[PDB]
Design a binder for these strands. Structure first.
Ligand SMILES: [Mg+2]
Ligand SMILES: [Mg+2]
Ligand SMILES: [Mg+2]
Ligand SMILES: [Mg+2]
Ligand SMILES: [Mg+2]
Ligand SMILES: [Mg+2]
Ligand SMILES: [Mg+2]
Ligand SMILES: [Mg+2]
Ligand SMILES: [Mg+2]
Ligand SMILES: [Mg+2]
Ligand SMILES: [Mg+2]
Ligand SMILES: [Mg+2]
Ligand SMILES: [Mg+2]
Ligand SMILES: [Mg+2]
Ligand SMILES: [Mg+2]
Ligand SMILES: [Mg+2]
Lengths: 151, 55, 145, 71, 184, 53, 24, 107, 140, 73, 196
RNA sequence: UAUACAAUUAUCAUAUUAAAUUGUUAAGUGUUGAUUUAACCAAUAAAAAUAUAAAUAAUUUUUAUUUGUUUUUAAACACCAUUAGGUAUAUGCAAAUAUAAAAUUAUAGUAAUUAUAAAUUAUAUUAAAAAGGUAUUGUUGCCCACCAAUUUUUAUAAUAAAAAUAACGUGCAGUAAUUAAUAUAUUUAUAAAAAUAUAUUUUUUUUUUUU
């Protein structure tokens, strides 16, 4: 099972998708979280960190055990992989929920910075300066269609 | 009226089996339907290609 | 009335065709109406005119107006043509009924004037349909022997 | 068949028999026979709206002959 | 678990699975046997088989059996399919009658043509052209001609084609004998 | 027809099967060449492609 | 429901049954 | 003349459409023992009632098999087997018509 | 030229159009013909005029004294229909009338159900047949 | 929603006859000429005194196949 | 005049009010369309929109009728080909070209036969277009919903039997062996729906 | 602000002159094993056929009666979940499209409408010929829900309901649309929705007058 998601993502998504992925770990499946679409490497890991620090928060309360497997920090892919505990004999012999921590993060971070700097391309896409029409509803002042104030 | 059946059995059976074979290999040349022919690979390819079409 | 309709000859090719509704009349007892869809304005005008001369109706003026109510509907347009002391009608319907030389007719389209459907086309086709359903008194008398 | 429905009368369906038989251009109609119904027939035949009519002293019905002119 | 005989999994071959009923001689199939053919001496069983199969296929029995014996379908889809089948039949019948009513006219024009040939060449001549033995001096000629006609009239066994069964992926129809798409 | 002669029939299938296996090869029809669609406007018909037979 | 039409769809067909339902 | 035959079968046959005539049951079925659809072999409704009832009874008494037509060959005399050599002006067979057309044209 | 088609219909498409030599029915046909030429009438209207024209009281019951299945002989019809085109000035060269009226009938003689016609395609209507398949047409 | 191709131009199968029927033209032309302002065509000059038959009615208006509508056909 | 009354100068002549609002209908019925081809809605033959119709559904099986090129197709010579096949299979010492002569005779005739049948069939297409086909103008009869009114008549009946109550209702399907698996006191066969 | 439905034919929830209800039949062992499936995993496999006639038409059943939910698996299929099971189809309860109605939405104060069907849209093995569009120079077309702000009415249910609405983020539900859709039923749930049981075409058709 592989979950691919974008760089810009709501708190909402983080919540329900976290619960999903953990529910998938509980059933013994392969789990890999992947960002193949990103503005910056830094952002990409911002979200990997978000999703993971939500995941342990939720999966520790329902107490399902999995160990962190693989961090691939790369030009076109920013990804982490988790492996479940095989049996209740595996849960009692090794009882751990094992995650990366500041060292592994920051290290594969600088590794992504250098890996991406070497290829000369720092992201698949970047945000565009376009402003779509936006209503704010009730306002205290004059506002143009894009949601900006009148000088 | 019943059946003529030629004369000797094996000489008839040879013919029947021959023409069954010829029909088998004139059959094998008929176009199948796209769906029968293609794998699940290109099914999923065309699926994503369709979902994303709005861009 | 004049109007514009888009006519698609192909998925690329698009023409602008126009649409005419008119009525030919002479107060001496003969009128007719026509409509057409053509490429140009002049074209649709001429087409509508020969379509209106194809459909010419006449009216027996011995009686000068209908002697009984005619209740008749054109497509979706319910029309009442009834005897009156004078000519009473919508301005357009009125000079259509004048085109026939009716003195005593009176006529109403669709109960309330706000009732759907209402188009200039409908207004014309209605009164012409109604008049075309009208029976002369002589004809009625022979009809009963 | 129910409450909200109209309550029909021999006159009501006498008229509608004749109307529908006139639309289908029939020569004869069999029609309900009551006092005012065959009264109505005699009056219509007076004015010549109807070719003829007869009551056979049949209880239910009697018959009317329709007239067409100029098609 | 217990399966019917026309079920997919019916007669299984596995370490657990064991076939049910008396399987030989006087058997489980005793009064359940739809067809029986005594093989005529010196007749290959391939003609027998293709006769049986042509029969079943043309009368749409093999259609039915294949259809019902594979998947379940609600009585509504069964009705829809059967009545659709029957109404398509009705339509095509009313087409056939038209064709036939025309072909009898064509056949008439032909017979008429034959009449005109008759009064161009005379009746007897035309009969000559059609194989009339006016040259038959004695019975031996007659018996030669009629021996010819005998050797024509004797019917060699017809090998009638049975359309193959098409196995598709998830099997929307196991009635599938062609690759055309169908309305389920 | 030129050169007719009275010579006798041979044994059916005198020819030994070729070294290339025709059996192990799978037949491709629809995607074989590349095509250009003449579709002018609208969504392509779902029954031809995009629909299980 | 949404109070407006999300789609701009005008069919031009006028089946005689839809219009005069008194007679059909 | 009969779109749905009220003529088929002729009267005598009804007598034997009971449970104890396997033969006369059989002349109205297929070679598998199933009935023909109405628009294939049309039967007077009486005959259909009597027939499905018969086959039912006969089956539960053991006088007719649950599948198959045991009299299939014997019954062929009773069915109108139509020779391709004669022409019945009324057929839904489109083959036979064109066959005779062929024949005469070739003549 | 469509005139010849019309006349073909009056001749061959009508069972029992009375005795067509009689000056009465003859005048009916004459007038209607001159009204199909010069466009004063639709072909359909003139045909329905012809078959609905007034002939003689108790027409069918006098028809039982001549005809079995109500099909009269077609000679009077064709002789009258040629006569009318000759006496009216229809053609510049006299023979052409008769020839065309004759020829168009002879060609249709070979057709399946030759003297019956579908009522919609028989005459002018909104939807028509292609010029090859039109009935007494020169292009068949 | 699939429909037979030409339903757009489909004729009215009940009423398409009315337009062409001889009586209609007799009445219409009758009140046209009555005006004094129209020169009567000659067919009118003729059928003026030989008006068409009365009781011939179509099958569209009368839904009876067994009705023998025409004295002629 | 010089052409049809249902077709004027610019296209099909627009009679009903549908034509004036939607005048694409006058000039385009499809990709088989030409200008002479308006008012004749069927287009030429072998051409797009050339197919004749029968009660509204088009006739696309014509060859299958005369038995040229069909699976059910009529075969001219069988006895010959079988006879010759038998000859080939029996022995190699004697070779019979007599059989191959009877056969090639048979074929030589077959050619002309087939051209005849094809010609007669095209005449049938012409006749069918003139005297039968409605030119796609009438409603389909060939699919069950077109007959809905018929089925309605039957549902109505099963309702009046039920005291005019359950419309479209049918008996609950029970089980493969509902009758013999149920104890005394419970319904062993499916009842009328009103009876439940 | 007042100022004239229909009554010959109108599809969602106020039924009504009706003949049913009850039937104890079938099926099962020889032996050493790759069946089913596009693909996984559990693991004996065979099976449950019969009823017409008759019941009279209308006038005070509307608090009465009535519209596919059903004991028994030590019996299966089927379906649901997954090597550990659940369930496996009218003895409780249960009015309800077969139409009596007055412009759309909305619990009957919210927005200003809505709904709709035949024009147009290139590939379905005939001796080339049958096909659909919620789009409207038309699939690079439109649309669908959750997920923020705000606006406004109220009959405040995890977190009230409803209506306006132009962000952000998920997807890809719908236009026969990548396992056809639609309605009811029951279950399921990030969100459109999905699984199963029935009806059904506002889905595209493939056609044995005793073989
Ligand atoms: Mg208004
Ligand atoms: Mg179990
Ligand atoms: Mg709208
Ligand atoms: Mg549309
Ligand atoms: Mg659709
Ligand atoms: Mg179309
Ligand atoms: Mg087309
Ligand atoms: Mg109600
Ligand atoms: Mg509020
Ligand atoms: Mg709210
Ligand atoms: Mg989708
Ligand atoms: Mg779906
Ligand atoms: Mg779908
Ligand atoms: Mg649904
Ligand atoms: Mg969901
Ligand atoms: Mg649902």
């Amino acid at each position: 099972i592989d979950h691919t998601f974008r760089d810009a993502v709501d708190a909402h998504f983080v919540g329900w998708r976290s619960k999903k992925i953990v529910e998938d770990i509980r059933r013994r499946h392969p789990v890999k979280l992947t960002i193949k679409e990103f503005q910056s490497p830094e952002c990409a890991i911002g979200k990997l960190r978000e999703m993971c620090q939500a995941m342990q928060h939720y999966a520790q309360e329902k107490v399902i055990y999995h160990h962190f497997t693989s961090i691939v920090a790369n030009d076109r892919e920013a990804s982490i992989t988790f492996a479940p505990a095989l049996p209740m004999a595996k849960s009692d012999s090794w009882k751990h929920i094992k995650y990366p921590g500041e060292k592994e993060w920051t290290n594969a971070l600088r590794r992504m910075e250098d890996a991406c700097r070497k290829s000369g391309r720092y992201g698949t896409y970047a945000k565009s300066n376009k402003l779509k029409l936006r209503s704010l509803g009730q306002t205290s002042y004059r506002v143009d269609k894009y949601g900006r104030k009148m000088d | 009226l019943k059946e003529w059946l030629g004369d000797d059995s094996r000489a008839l059976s040879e013919t029947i089996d021959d023409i069954s074979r010829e029909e088998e290999e004139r059959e094998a040349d008929i176009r199948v339907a796209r769906s029968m022919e293609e794998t699940d690979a290109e099914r999923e390819v065309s699926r994503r290609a369709y979902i994303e079409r709005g861009k | 009335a004049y109007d514009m309709r888009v006519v698609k000859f192909s998925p690329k090719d698009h023409r602008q065709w126009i649409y005419c509704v008119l009525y030919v009349g002479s107060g001496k007892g003969i009128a007719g109406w026509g409509r057409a869809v053509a490429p140009s304005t002049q074209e649709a005008k001429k087409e509508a005119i020969r379509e209106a001369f194809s459909n010419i109706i006449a009216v027996d003026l011995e009686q000068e107006g209908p002697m009984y109510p005619v209740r008749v509907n054109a497509d979706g347009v319910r029309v009442l043509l009834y005897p009156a002391r004078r000519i009473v009608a919508n301005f357009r319907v009125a000079d259509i009924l004048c085109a026939f030389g009716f003195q005593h007719a009176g006529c109403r389209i669709n109960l309330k004037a706000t009732n759907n459907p209402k188009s200039p086309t409908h207004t014309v086709e209605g009164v012409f349909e109604a008049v075309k359903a009208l029976r002369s008194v002589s004809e009625i008398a022979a009809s009963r022997g | 068949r129910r409450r909200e429905e109209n309550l029909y009368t021999p006159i009501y369906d006498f008229c509608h028999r004749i109307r529908e038989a006139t639309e289908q251009r029939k020569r004869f109609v069999v029609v309900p026979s009551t006092i005012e119904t065959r009264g109505c027939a005699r009056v219509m035949h007076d004015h010549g709206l109807v070719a003829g009519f007869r009551d056979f002293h049949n209880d239910r019905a009697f018959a009317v002959e329709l007239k067409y002119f100029q098609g | 678990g217990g399966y019917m005989m026309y079920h997919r999994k019916a007669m299984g071959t596995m370490k657990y699975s064991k076939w049910k009923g008396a399987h030989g001689g006087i058997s489980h199939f005793y009064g359940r046997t739809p067809m029986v053919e005594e093989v005529r001496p010196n007749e290959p069983i391939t003609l027998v088989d293709r006769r049986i199969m042509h029969y079943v296929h043309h009368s749409r029995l093999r259609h039915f059996q294949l259809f019902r014996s594979y998947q379940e379908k609600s009585n509504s889809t069964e009705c829809k399919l059967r009545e659709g089948e029957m109404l398509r039949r009705r339509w095509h019948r009313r087409l056939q009658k038209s064709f036939i009513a025309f072909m009898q006219f064509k056949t008439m024009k032909v017979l008429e043509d034959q009449a005109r040939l008759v009064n161009t060449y005379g009746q007897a001549a035309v009969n000559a052209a059609l194989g009339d033995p006016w040259n038959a001096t004695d019975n031996v000629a007659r018996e030669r001609k009629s021996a010819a006609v005998r050797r024509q009239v004797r019917a060699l066994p017809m090998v009638n084609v049975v359309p193959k069964h098409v196995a598709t992926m998830k099997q929307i129809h196991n009635d599938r004998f062609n690759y055309r798409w169908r309305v389920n | 027809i030129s050169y007719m002669e009275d010579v006798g029939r041979s044994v059916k299938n005198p020819t030994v099967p070729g070294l290339m296996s025709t059996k192990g090869m799978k037949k491709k029809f629809h995607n074989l060449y590349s095509s250009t669609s003449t579709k002018r406007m609208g969504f392509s018909n779902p029954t031809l492609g995009i629909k299980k037979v | 429901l949404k109070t407006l039409d999300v789609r701009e769809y005008r069919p031009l067909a006028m089946p005689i049954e839809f219009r005069f339902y008194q007679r059909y | 003349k009969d779109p749905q035959g009220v003529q088929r079968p002729s009267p005598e046959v009804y007598m034997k459409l009971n449970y104890k005539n396997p033969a006369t049951i059989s002349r109205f079925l297929t070679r598998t023992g199933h009935m023909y659809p109405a628009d294939i072999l049309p039967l007077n409704p009486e005959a259909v009632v009597k027939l499905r009832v018969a086959k039912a009874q006969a089956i539960r008494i053991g006088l007719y098999p649950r599948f198959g037509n045991p009299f299939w060959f014997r019954s062929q005399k009773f069915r109108p087997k139509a020779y391709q050599e004669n022409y019945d002006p009324t057929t839904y067979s489109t083959k036979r018509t064109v066959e005779h057309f062929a024949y005469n044209w070739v003549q | 030229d469509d005139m010849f088609i019309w006349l073909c219909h009056t001749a061959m498409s009508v069972l029992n159009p009375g005795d067509m030599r009689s000056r009465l029915i003859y005048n009916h046909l004459r007038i209607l013909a001159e009204s199909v030429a010069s466009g004063e009438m639709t072909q359909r209207t003139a045909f329905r005029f012809f078959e609905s024209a007034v002939r003689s009281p108790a027409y069918r019951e006098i028809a039982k004294r001549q005809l079995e299945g109500g099909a009269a002989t077609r000679l009077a019809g064709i002789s009258a229909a040629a006569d009318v085109m000759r006496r009216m000035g229809l053609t510049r060269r006299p023979m052409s009338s008769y020839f065309e009226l004759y020829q168009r009938i002879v060609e249709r003689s070979e057709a399946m159900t030759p003297w019956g016609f579908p009522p919609l395609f028989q005459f002018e209507e909104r939807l028509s047949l292609e010029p090859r398949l039109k009935f007494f047409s020169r292009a068949s | 929603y699939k429909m037979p191709k030409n339903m757009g131009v489909a004729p009215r199968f009940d009423t398409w006859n009315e337009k062409y029927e001889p009586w209609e033209h007799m009445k219409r032309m009758g009140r046209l000429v009555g005006t004094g302002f129209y020169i009567p065509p000659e067919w009118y000059n003729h059928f003026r005194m030989f008006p068409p038959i009365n009781h011939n009615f179509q099958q569209e208006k009368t839904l009876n196949p067994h009705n023998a509508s025409e004295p002629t056909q | 005049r010089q052409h049809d009354s249902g077709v004027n100068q610019y296209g099909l002549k627009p009679t009903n009010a549908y034509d004036y609002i939607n005048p694409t209908n006058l000039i385009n019925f499809g990709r088989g369309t030409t200008f002479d081809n308006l008012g004749v809605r069927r287009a030429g033959r072998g051409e797009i929109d050339s197919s004749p119709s029968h009660s509204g559904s088009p006739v696309f099986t014509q060859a299958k009728l005369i038995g040229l090129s069909g699976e059910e197709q009529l075969t001219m010579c069988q006895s010959e080909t079988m006879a010759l096949r038998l000859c080939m299979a029996k022995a190699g010492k004697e070779t019979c070209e007599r059989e191959s002569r009877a056969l090639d005779s048979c074929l030589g005739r077959v050619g002309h036969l087939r051209r005849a049948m094809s010609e007669a069939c095209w005449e049938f297409n012409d006749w069918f277009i003139q005297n039968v086909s409605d030119n796609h103008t009438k409603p389909f009869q060939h699919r069950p919903h077109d007959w809905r009114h018929f089925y309605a008549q039957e549902k109505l009946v099963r309702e009046r039997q039920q005291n005019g109550h359950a419309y479209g209702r049918r008996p609950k399907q029970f089980s493969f062996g509902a009758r013999y698996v149920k104890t005394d006191g419970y319904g062993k066969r499916p009842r009328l729906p009103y009876n439940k």
